[PDB]
Design a protein around this motif. Structure first.
Motif, PDB file in Angstrom:
ATOM      1  N   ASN A   1      -7.347  -1.563   0.330  1.00  0.00           N
ATOM      2  CA  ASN A   1      -6.122  -2.344   0.478  1.00  0.00           C
ATOM      3  C   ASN A   1      -6.313  -3.512   1.438  1.00  0.00           C
ATOM      4  OD1 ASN A   1      -3.476  -3.198   0.295  1.00  0.00           O
ATOM      5  ND2 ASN A   1      -2.627  -1.527   1.530  1.00  0.00           N
TER       6      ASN A   1
ATOM      7  N   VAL B   1      -0.214   8.241  -1.687  1.00  0.00           N
ATOM      8  CA  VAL B   1      -1.110   8.626  -0.602  1.00  0.00           C
ATOM      9  C   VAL B   1      -0.748  10.077  -0.322  1.00  0.00           C
ATOM     10  CG1 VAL B   1      -1.050   6.304   0.349  1.00  0.00           C
ATOM     11  CG2 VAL B   1       0.180   8.158   1.517  1.00  0.00           C
TER      12      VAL B   1
ATOM     13  N   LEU C   1       0.755  -1.207   0.000  1.00  0.00           N
ATOM     14  CA  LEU C   1       0.000   0.000   0.000  1.00  0.00           C
ATOM     15  C   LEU C   1       0.915   1.463   0.000  1.00  0.00           C
ATOM     16  CD1 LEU C   1       1.704  -0.806   2.532  1.00  0.00           C
ATOM     17  CD2 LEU C   1       0.927   1.548   2.953  1.00  0.00           C
TER      18      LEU C   1
ATOM     19  N   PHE D   1     -10.221  14.714   2.377  1.00  0.00           N
ATOM     20  CA  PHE D   1      -8.939  14.078   2.660  1.00  0.00           C
ATOM     21  C   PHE D   1      -9.130  12.782   3.439  1.00  0.00           C
ATOM     22  CE2 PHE D   1      -6.003  13.514   6.224  1.00  0.00           C
ATOM     23  CZ  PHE D   1      -4.878  13.091   5.551  1.00  0.00           C
TER      24      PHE D   1
ATOM     25  N   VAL E   1      -3.231  12.758  -1.473  1.00  0.00           N
ATOM     26  CA  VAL E   1      -4.330  13.189  -0.616  1.00  0.00           C
ATOM     27  C   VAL E   1      -3.869  14.280   0.343  1.00  0.00           C
ATOM     28  CG1 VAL E   1      -6.376  12.264   0.506  1.00  0.00           C
ATOM     29  CG2 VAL E   1      -4.776  10.711  -0.640  1.00  0.00           C
ATOM     30  N   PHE E   2      -2.612  14.224   0.790  1.00  0.00           N
ATOM     31  CA  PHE E   2      -2.108  15.228   1.721  1.00  0.00           C
ATOM     32  C   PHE E   2      -1.830  16.556   1.029  1.00  0.00           C
ATOM     33  CE2 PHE E   2      -1.537  12.932   5.677  1.00  0.00           C
ATOM     34  CZ  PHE E   2      -1.579  11.612   5.273  1.00  0.00           C
TER      35      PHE E   2
ATOM     36  N   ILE F   1       2.393   5.909   7.010  1.00  0.00           N
ATOM     37  CA  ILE F   1       1.119   6.599   6.831  1.00  0.00           C
ATOM     38  C   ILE F   1       0.384   6.765   8.156  1.00  0.00           C
ATOM     39  CG2 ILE F   1      -1.084   6.566   5.612  1.00  0.00           C
ATOM     40  CD1 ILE F   1       0.230   4.956   3.419  1.00  0.00           C
TER      41      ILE F   1
ATOM     42  N   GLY G   1      -6.137  23.470   1.230  1.00  0.00           N
ATOM     43  CA  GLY G   1      -7.364  23.950   1.840  1.00  0.00           C
ATOM     44  C   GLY G   1      -7.131  24.656   3.160  1.00  0.00           C
ATOM     45  N   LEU G   2      -6.069  24.278   3.877  1.00  0.00           N
ATOM     46  CA  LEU G   2      -5.724  24.981   5.108  1.00  0.00           C
ATOM     47  C   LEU G   2      -5.106  26.341   4.806  1.00  0.00           C
ATOM     48  CD1 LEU G   2      -4.267  22.029   7.227  1.00  0.00           C
ATOM     49  CD2 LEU G   2      -6.631  22.840   7.045  1.00  0.00           C
TER      50      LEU G   2
ATOM     51  N   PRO H   1      -2.183  -2.348   6.101  1.00  0.00           N
ATOM     52  CA  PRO H   1      -2.635  -1.803   4.809  1.00  0.00           C
ATOM     53  C   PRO H   1      -2.425  -0.316   4.604  1.00  0.00           C
ATOM     54  CG  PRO H   1      -4.447  -2.131   6.293  1.00  0.00           C
ATOM     55  CD  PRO H   1      -3.231  -2.624   7.013  1.00  0.00           C
TER      56      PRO H   1
ATOM     57  N   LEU I   1       2.551   4.422  -0.176  1.00  0.00           N
ATOM     58  CA  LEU I   1       2.146   5.797   0.133  1.00  0.00           C
ATOM     59  C   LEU I   1       2.755   6.935  -0.788  1.00  0.00           C
ATOM     60  CD1 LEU I   1       4.816   7.472   1.304  1.00  0.00           C
ATOM     61  CD2 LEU I   1       4.451   6.024   3.303  1.00  0.00           C
TER      62      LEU I   1
ATOM     63  N   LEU J   1      -5.066  18.698   0.829  1.00  0.00           N
ATOM     64  CA  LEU J   1      -5.613  19.149   2.104  1.00  0.00           C
ATOM     65  C   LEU J   1      -4.909  20.399   2.622  1.00  0.00           C
ATOM     66  CD1 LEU J   1      -7.280  18.891   4.725  1.00  0.00           C
ATOM     67  CD2 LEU J   1      -5.506  17.336   5.560  1.00  0.00           C
TER      68      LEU J   1
ATOM     69  N   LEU K   1      -5.840  28.028   2.008  1.00  0.00           N
ATOM     70  CA  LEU K   1      -7.000  28.784   1.547  1.00  0.00           C
ATOM     71  C   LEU K   1      -7.856  29.248   2.716  1.00  0.00           C
ATOM     72  CD1 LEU K   1      -8.751  29.769  -0.859  1.00  0.00           C
ATOM     73  CD2 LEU K   1      -9.872  27.532  -0.822  1.00  0.00           C
TER      74      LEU K   1
ATOM     75  N   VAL L   1     -12.654  20.586   3.055  1.00  0.00           N
ATOM     76  CA  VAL L   1     -11.477  19.966   2.453  1.00  0.00           C
ATOM     77  C   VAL L   1     -10.973  18.814   3.315  1.00  0.00           C
ATOM     78  CG1 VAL L   1      -9.150  20.385   1.594  1.00  0.00           C
ATOM     79  CG2 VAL L   1     -10.913  22.137   1.325  1.00  0.00           C
TER      80      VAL L   1
END
Ligand SMILES: N#Cc1ccccc1-c1cc(-c2ccccn2)cn(-c2ccccc2)c1=O
Lengths: 35, 86, 44
Positions: free
Chosen positions: B74, A11, A6, B63, A14-15, B14, A21-22, B9, A8, A18, A24, B59
């Motif tokens: 996963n 991943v 998995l 997320f 996705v961070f 993370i 947006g903080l 997973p 990252l 965000l 903004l 937002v």
């Protein structure tokens, strides 16, 4: 068929949407503290 | 099994990365609006996520939506691989 | 009335950790259910 891991490495996608947006949120927080 | 198996997973990097976004949003609600403010922020944290404060939860809601979706996806991939499997 | 709606600073951390706890079970219930639908097992 072992991993099934998995990664990252994506991943972080996705961070990165965000924190924008903080940032903004801090621009609207200053126009509300003045108006 | 085990408790080190309670971090799979989502990567070992993370589970220690989601916590950076949790304290990063509770400090923005501190700036868009201390013992009761932190009570409101995760009072707003588990309930998904002012115009400056609304876009914080809007937002943050997207997320956390992908992570809980990237966790359930996963986790099922292993259970399918740990399914047939012979 | 606070349980159906997922989960005072002392009362805030109660509904937050409980929200993460119930998040994993419903994610493990959906993941384990989705794996059987794929590979239909036969029990002898
Ligand atoms: N290892 C293990 C294991 C054994 C029995 C039942 C489930 C697991 C397992 C648990 C988890 C896990 C991790 C964090 C939180 C909750 N569950 C993960 N994995 C897993 C999933 C994908 C790849 C490797 C291990 C697992 O295989």
């Amino acid at each position: 068929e072992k991993t099934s891991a998995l990664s990252l490495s994506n991943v972080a996608g996705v961070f990165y949407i965000l924190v924008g947006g903080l940032g903004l949120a801090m621009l609207v927080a200053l126009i509300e503290f003045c108006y | 099994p085990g408790v080190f198996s309670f971090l799979d997973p989502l990567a070992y990097e993370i589970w220690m990365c989601i916590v950076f976004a949790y304290i990063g949003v509770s400090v923005v609600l501190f700036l868009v609006s201390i013992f009761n403010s932190l009570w409101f922020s995760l009072g707003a944290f588990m309930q998904q996520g002012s115009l400056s404060g609304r876009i914080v939860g809007g937002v943050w809601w997207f997320f956390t939506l992908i992570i809980i979706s990237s966790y359930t996806a996963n986790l099922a991939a292993f259970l399918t691989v740990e399914r047939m499997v012979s």
